Design a protein around this ligand. Structure first.
Ligand SMILES: NC1=N[C@@](c2cccc(-c3cncnc3)c2)(c2ccnc(C(F)F)c2)c2cccc(F)c21
Ligand code: NA
Length: 371
């Protein structure tokens, strides 16, 4: 155990409900399913009964628990609040190690836990800068790296199951080349989008529009979220490409499903979306190409099962671009913290006409694209 091979397929999930890894907290170990979240920096676990919780962290049963005598209140679409402490943590299908880490024991929450998601807490994988109550609460990955010989890198293969490879890159999880984009600032995993194309047609905006006010890679968000101006242009362009069929406005707003008779989804009418990411060299970029099989999220429901029903998984944001799970799915994503960069490669996990791609280089002879 502890080898990248034994880490393959260590993630599970429910579509739109996040991807989770099995973890243990306390001594003796208490097994919990934990949402893998690149969009936050707290390790926070249900620590009191809840209607949506199968199990929860019982601090009174752990001799290794240490109370930090400090509250944490996290309002955000909902909220969670609790108490801080430290305890022994391990990932049974991860590295062969046990570490002492900060843990926020969630004692009260609103719209945080989801009915039937199968997870009991969240593993915030981003940086200390966005940790709550402040940057002095060391995130889990920082403790893991400080306490062991685990390399300062992790990778995610999200399969729309999947794999979280801690401390390395597993070559069996992707094909082709790994293309790197710089982490602009170590808070969220912030990146820069330099160009957006839909059906190979450039949106023709100043590239700063794509990164208003930041662009991040977030496994804890389902959708591709875009700033208002970008979102409006994307929708207009997708509507034009798919004009042979007209859908309700609620569909485009992500509040209404679109259904087709089972096996008849007209994938061909929907365009490919290309996001060009800043390269590791000046004015060089690479693109990641997403198919409608990624941006039209199937909604599993026995009641609608004579059909295949989808939610449009692209939505408006007022807090910048969010490259959520629907974007990460079908790409092997390397969070290369040691080299302050994020790598993308086509994942080993489309149709007979098109395939998702990671390709480059592209030259734009260009202004700075960030805020
Ligand atoms: N990326 C994020 N992680 C948060 C979160 C909280 C609860 C459930 C999910 C989730 C639901 N469905 C599918 N995937 C994920 C995500 C989050 C917000 C605040 N505090 C934390 C904390 F635990 F670190 C996490 C969250 C809330 C809102 C916007 C976001 F970008 C995130
Ligand atoms: Na180390």
């Amino acid at each position: 155990k502890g080898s990248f091979v034994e880490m393959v397929d260590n993630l599970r999930g429910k579509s739109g409900q996040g991807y989770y890894v099995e973890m243990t907290v306390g001594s003796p170990p208490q097994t919990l399913n934990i949402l893998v979240d690149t969009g936050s920096s707290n390790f926070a676990v249900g620590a009191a009964p809840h209607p949506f919780l199968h199990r929860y962290y019982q601090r009174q049963l752990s001799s290794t628990y240490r109370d930090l005598r400090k509250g944490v209140y996290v309002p955000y679409q909902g909220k969670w609040e609790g108490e801080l402490g430290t305890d022994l943590v391990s990932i049974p299908h991860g590295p062969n190690v046990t570490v002492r880490a900060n843990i926020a024991a969630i004692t009260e929450s609103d719209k945080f836990f989801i009915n039937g998601s199968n997870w009991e807490g969240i593993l915030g994988l981003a940086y200390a800068e966005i940790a709550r109550p402040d940057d002095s609460l060391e995130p889990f990955f920082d403790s893991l790296v400080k306490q062991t010989h685990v390399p300062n890198l992790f990778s995610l293969q999200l399969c729309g199951g999947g794999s979280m490879i801690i401390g390395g890159i597993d070559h069996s999880l992707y094909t082709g080349s790994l293309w790197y984009t710089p982490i602009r600032r170590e808070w969220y995993y912030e990146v820069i989008i330099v160009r957006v194309e839909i059906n190979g047609q450039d949106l023709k905006m100043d590239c700063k529009e794509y990164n208003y006010d930041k662009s991040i890679v977030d496994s804890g968000t389902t959708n591709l979220r875009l700033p208002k101006k970008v979102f409006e242009a994307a929708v207009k362009s997708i509507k034009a490409a798919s004009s042979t069929e007209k859908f309700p406005d609620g569909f485009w707003l992500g509040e209404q499903l679109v259904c087709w008779q089972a096996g008849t989804t007209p994938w061909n009418i929907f365009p490919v979306i290309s996001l060009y990411l800043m390269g590791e060299v000046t004015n060089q970029s690479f693109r990641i190409t997403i198919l409608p099989q990624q941006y039209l999220r199937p909604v599993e429901d026995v009641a609608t099962s004579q059909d295949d029903c989808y939610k449009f998984a692209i939505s408006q944001s007022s807090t910048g671009t969010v490259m959520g799970a629907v974007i990460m799915e079908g790409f092997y994503v390397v969070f290369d913290r040691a080299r302050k960069r994020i790598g993308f490669a086509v994942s080993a996990c489309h149709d007979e006409f098109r395939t998702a791609a990671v390709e480059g280089p592209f030259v734009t002879l260009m202004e700075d694209c960030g805020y």
